Amino acid sequence: MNNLYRELAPVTDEAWGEIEQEATRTFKRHIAGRRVVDCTGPTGATTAAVSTGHLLDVTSPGDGVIAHLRDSRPLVRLRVPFTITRDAIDDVERGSQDSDWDPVKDAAKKLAFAEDRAIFEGYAAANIQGIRAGSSNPGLALPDDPRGYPDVIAQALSELRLAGVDGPYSVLLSADAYTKVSETTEHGYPLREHLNRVVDGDIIWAPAIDGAFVLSTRGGDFDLQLGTDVSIGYSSHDADTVQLYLQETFTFLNYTAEASVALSA
Amino acid sequence: MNNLYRELAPVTDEAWGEIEQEATRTFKRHIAGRRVVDCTGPTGATTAAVSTGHLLDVTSPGDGVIAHLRDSRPLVRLRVPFTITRDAIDDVERGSQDSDWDPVKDAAKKLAFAEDRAIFEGYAAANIQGIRAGSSNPGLALPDDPRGYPDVIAQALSELRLAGVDGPYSVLLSADAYTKVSETTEHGYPLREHLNRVVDGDIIWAPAIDGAFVLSTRGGDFDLQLGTDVSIGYSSHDADTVQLYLQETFTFLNYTAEASVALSA
Amino acid sequence: MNNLYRELAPVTDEAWGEIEQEATRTFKRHIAGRRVVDCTGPTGATTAAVSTGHLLDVTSPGDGVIAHLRDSRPLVRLRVPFTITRDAIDDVERGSQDSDWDPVKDAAKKLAFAEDRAIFEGYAAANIQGIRAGSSNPGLALPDDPRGYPDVIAQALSELRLAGVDGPYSVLLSADAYTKVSETTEHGYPLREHLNRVVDGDIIWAPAIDGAFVLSTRGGDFDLQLGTDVSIGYSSHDADTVQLYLQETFTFLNYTAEASVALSA
């Protein structure tokens, strides 16, 4: 057995396969960060913190001793509990499709949005600085006319060039901002066909974040430290329902404050 | 012999080859569904229904017994009768072309439109829910200016993204709506060259349906269960004509109500 | 794991072996049908219905299309819940006999009687016609003097001969009717030794049914379609008791209405 207690769940292996596929697809769909950032681990269940390598002054233990407490960032565990009906589970070994995995999908969306907001917006209670607060470049703003977005993006890319940051650059837009750039034409010309040439990397739907971000993807600038990847485990059950949860443990380290521009909403 | 009774038809093998080729080409041309939906079977002549895996409460047979009647969806057989002249058949072994297979073509069009309207518009008498009624996403509408269609399509695709549905997405338009998007330019730029980039799958002529549909083609969301594929069989003949029919038996299962948007006319 | 959730039950493997043996013996003892009828399957967990091969007229989907909905009979699942004490289970690995499996026995009796009454008496809520309602031969009656039973049975067998139905014929009697024919002598001669020669097949105790039935056992006339054979699974437990259930899913098809005579009580 294992800390997930899957062997205790009234969930047949076919329904485990279904819940795993639904969670994996929904998380991969909503998660923006792991396309951009370097993705280190999973280092395992025993990793509690990561070495920042820095040292902190602390009161000496005794005469003439110098004491430096070593700095580290703790890993945070996020867990989203979700309840699936036993009806939907038992239907699976009867060969069903259209078992209602909407609790799994909504849970995986909440988890992906919590991770992505920890990465980009920061999560103070975990001491995750986040790309927005950890960005040294001038904060831009998106206009109300999406036809201006290639201007603000070429501005941000000129900030990145002047800051000395290599490509390949990539741009992340919030869900509505991506809708706008998906509709928009300039004089009938597809404006995302202009963006696909202004931006030499990729243009990414990031529904969790606010405004937009322009980033380098040269590597080494952003590091998502996974302790444990997205895991499905058992909480409880009753006559009608099984309480499961989605869980991961991670921390985000922002190594290069110049490597990002925040485009505020 | 066989339930088609082809051996009883006054139709030479060359004219069977001609009628089969005409029916196959005309059905493949008109049928939209089988390009989008997963296409399971033909499971054979013995399949009468498909397991939905669900269970239905029914009155118990006796004290303390629990009885659950198992849910299933019946297969429907569609048959279109068509009459070809014996003149046109006997001409075939004389090496003719321009034998009048227009009855075969009109029959294959009626059959393809009946299948596609069962899939998309639903067929109440078969308990086929259909994608339109079985779609949970907000119902859109097409504008009178086709230059607006990339907007309504990027709207529907944003609904699909927000609903968490993967691509590759595809768009089906009714015959006139496809004519309109085939003509249209925006500022001279081919508007279907914009659509070919907004839509990462395919843009499909679907003359049977009303308005338009935007769908995912990731698989597993729509399942056309063929009992028997399109089959040509013999009904009767007289001195001048042979009554044939086109027939198939199928059911359509709509597993993912979120995976579709109906764009009403 | 599996839809029975046996791995979740606090029931040691020795007590599983005991409960399986008690259920199997008690079901085989009470079940009359499966000695007479052909017994097809178990076809598996995915079978929801059986093809009757017939076709049903339904409203056409469109001009000139002919639509026939295919007829099928749904499978019914019967479940009898039964509670065994954990005392009786834990006694088993201590090497006990006279663990109180009377809940298992009473459950297997209720299940066997529900199946046999579905087969013979019919089960309207499952659309099981049943041999009694599905018998075309004249309905006989049993007399109050069991010494008349060889007469009524030779009458029924003459009905079967005149109806053109082969042997080997068999006779099923309700529990008291079998008691009566077990006691009875005519002039000291064992009357079941007369019946063993009037009836060339077998004489069967059928406690579930009313009156008696005389049947052919040539095969092909009666078909019990098992989806899943008698299965033991776990519902819940507490500190003192385990709620289990006995379950099967089946349907009965009565192919030859002339092949049976109902001898009413």
PDB file of C-alpha atoms in Angstrom, chain B residues 45-52 55 58-61 63-72 74-81 110-111 114 123 125-127 249, chain C residues 45-52 55 58-61 63-72 74-81 110-111 114 123 125-127 249:
ATOM      1  CA  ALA B  45     -26.293  -8.545 -38.354  1.00  0.00           C
ATOM      2  CA  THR B  46     -26.901  -9.906 -34.836  1.00  0.00           C
ATOM      3  CA  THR B  47     -26.405  -6.600 -32.978  1.00  0.00           C
ATOM      4  CA  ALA B  48     -29.790  -5.221 -31.912  1.00  0.00           C
ATOM      5  CA  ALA B  49     -28.700  -2.714 -29.246  1.00  0.00           C
ATOM      6  CA  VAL B  50     -25.706  -1.203 -27.458  1.00  0.00           C
ATOM      7  CA  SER B  51     -25.010  -1.243 -23.717  1.00  0.00           C
ATOM      8  CA  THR B  52     -25.216   2.228 -22.214  1.00  0.00           C
ATOM      9  CA  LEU B  55     -29.277   0.673 -14.859  1.00  0.00           C
ATOM     10  CA  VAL B  58     -37.967  -1.494 -11.821  1.00  0.00           C
ATOM     11  CA  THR B  59     -40.603  -3.041  -9.578  1.00  0.00           C
ATOM     12  CA  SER B  60     -39.091  -5.862  -7.549  1.00  0.00           C
ATOM     13  CA  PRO B  61     -40.052  -9.452  -8.442  1.00  0.00           C
ATOM     14  CA  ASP B  63     -39.805  -9.701  -1.162  1.00  0.00           C
ATOM     15  CA  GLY B  64     -36.321  -8.328  -0.537  1.00  0.00           C
ATOM     16  CA  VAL B  65     -35.090  -8.744  -4.113  1.00  0.00           C
ATOM     17  CA  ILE B  66     -33.623  -5.665  -5.799  1.00  0.00           C
ATOM     18  CA  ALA B  67     -34.208  -5.530  -9.554  1.00  0.00           C
ATOM     19  CA  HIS B  68     -32.398  -3.187 -11.945  1.00  0.00           C
ATOM     20  CA  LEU B  69     -33.328  -3.327 -15.623  1.00  0.00           C
ATOM     21  CA  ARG B  70     -30.252  -2.684 -17.736  1.00  0.00           C
ATOM     22  CA  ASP B  71     -30.381   0.319 -20.057  1.00  0.00           C
ATOM     23  CA  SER B  72     -29.597   0.017 -23.760  1.00  0.00           C
ATOM     24  CA  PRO B  74     -31.748   0.094 -29.886  1.00  0.00           C
ATOM     25  CA  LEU B  75     -30.279   0.129 -33.364  1.00  0.00           C
ATOM     26  CA  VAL B  76     -32.453   1.645 -36.086  1.00  0.00           C
ATOM     27  CA  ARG B  77     -32.471   0.338 -39.653  1.00  0.00           C
ATOM     28  CA  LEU B  78     -32.949   2.923 -42.394  1.00  0.00           C
ATOM     29  CA  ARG B  79     -33.952   1.774 -45.881  1.00  0.00           C
ATOM     30  CA  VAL B  80     -34.426   3.951 -48.967  1.00  0.00           C
ATOM     31  CA  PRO B  81     -36.155   2.158 -51.879  1.00  0.00           C
ATOM     32  CA  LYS B 110     -31.609  10.648 -49.019  1.00  0.00           C
ATOM     33  CA  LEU B 111     -29.862   7.981 -46.930  1.00  0.00           C
ATOM     34  CA  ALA B 114     -31.213  10.799 -42.958  1.00  0.00           C
ATOM     35  CA  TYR B 123     -34.139  11.255 -34.318  1.00  0.00           C
ATOM     36  CA  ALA B 125     -38.435   7.878 -32.764  1.00  0.00           C
ATOM     37  CA  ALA B 126     -35.112   6.026 -32.407  1.00  0.00           C
ATOM     38  CA  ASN B 127     -34.271   7.669 -29.048  1.00  0.00           C
ATOM     39  CA  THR B 249     -28.560  -0.063 -39.479  1.00  0.00           C
TER      40      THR B 249
ATOM     41  CA  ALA C  45     -20.658  -7.751 -18.106  1.00  0.00           C
ATOM     42  CA  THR C  46     -21.107  -5.788 -21.354  1.00  0.00           C
ATOM     43  CA  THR C  47     -24.283  -7.568 -22.525  1.00  0.00           C
ATOM     44  CA  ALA C  48     -27.292  -5.306 -21.953  1.00  0.00           C
ATOM     45  CA  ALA C  49     -29.850  -6.977 -24.243  1.00  0.00           C
ATOM     46  CA  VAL C  50     -30.433  -9.860 -26.648  1.00  0.00           C
ATOM     47  CA  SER C  51     -31.474  -9.624 -30.301  1.00  0.00           C
ATOM     48  CA  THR C  52     -34.963 -10.991 -30.858  1.00  0.00           C
ATOM     49  CA  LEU C  55     -38.182  -5.290 -36.348  1.00  0.00           C
ATOM     50  CA  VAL C  58     -41.341   3.625 -36.351  1.00  0.00           C
ATOM     51  CA  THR C  59     -42.056   7.080 -37.735  1.00  0.00           C
ATOM     52  CA  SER C  60     -39.829   7.772 -40.721  1.00  0.00           C
ATOM     53  CA  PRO C  61     -36.980  10.286 -40.312  1.00  0.00           C
ATOM     54  CA  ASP C  63     -39.350  11.745 -47.048  1.00  0.00           C
ATOM     55  CA  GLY C  64     -39.177   8.289 -48.610  1.00  0.00           C
ATOM     56  CA  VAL C  65     -36.978   6.751 -45.913  1.00  0.00           C
ATOM     57  CA  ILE C  66     -38.236   3.553 -44.281  1.00  0.00           C
ATOM     58  CA  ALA C  67     -37.219   3.172 -40.636  1.00  0.00           C
ATOM     59  CA  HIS C  68     -37.463  -0.063 -38.646  1.00  0.00           C
ATOM     60  CA  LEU C  69     -36.401   0.003 -35.002  1.00  0.00           C
ATOM     61  CA  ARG C  70     -34.799  -3.304 -34.088  1.00  0.00           C
ATOM     62  CA  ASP C  71     -36.460  -5.288 -31.308  1.00  0.00           C
ATOM     63  CA  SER C  72     -34.504  -6.546 -28.307  1.00  0.00           C
ATOM     64  CA  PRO C  74     -33.253  -6.111 -21.951  1.00  0.00           C
ATOM     65  CA  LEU C  75     -31.355  -8.063 -19.335  1.00  0.00           C
ATOM     66  CA  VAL C  76     -32.547  -7.662 -15.750  1.00  0.00           C
ATOM     67  CA  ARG C  77     -30.170  -7.698 -12.788  1.00  0.00           C
ATOM     68  CA  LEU C  78     -31.487  -9.262  -9.587  1.00  0.00           C
ATOM     69  CA  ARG C  79     -29.700  -8.559  -6.301  1.00  0.00           C
ATOM     70  CA  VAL C  80     -30.555  -9.979  -2.874  1.00  0.00           C
ATOM     71  CA  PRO C  81     -28.772  -8.217   0.024  1.00  0.00           C
ATOM     72  CA  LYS C 110     -34.788 -15.869  -2.460  1.00  0.00           C
ATOM     73  CA  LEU C 111     -32.605 -15.440  -5.556  1.00  0.00           C
ATOM     74  CA  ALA C 114     -36.971 -15.002  -8.063  1.00  0.00           C
ATOM     75  CA  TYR C 123     -41.814 -11.034 -14.712  1.00  0.00           C
ATOM     76  CA  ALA C 125     -41.505  -5.386 -15.246  1.00  0.00           C
ATOM     77  CA  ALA C 126     -38.661  -7.047 -17.182  1.00  0.00           C
ATOM     78  CA  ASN C 127     -40.876  -7.907 -20.189  1.00  0.00           C
ATOM     79  CA  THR C 249     -28.189 -10.653 -14.472  1.00  0.00           C
TER      80      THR C 249
END
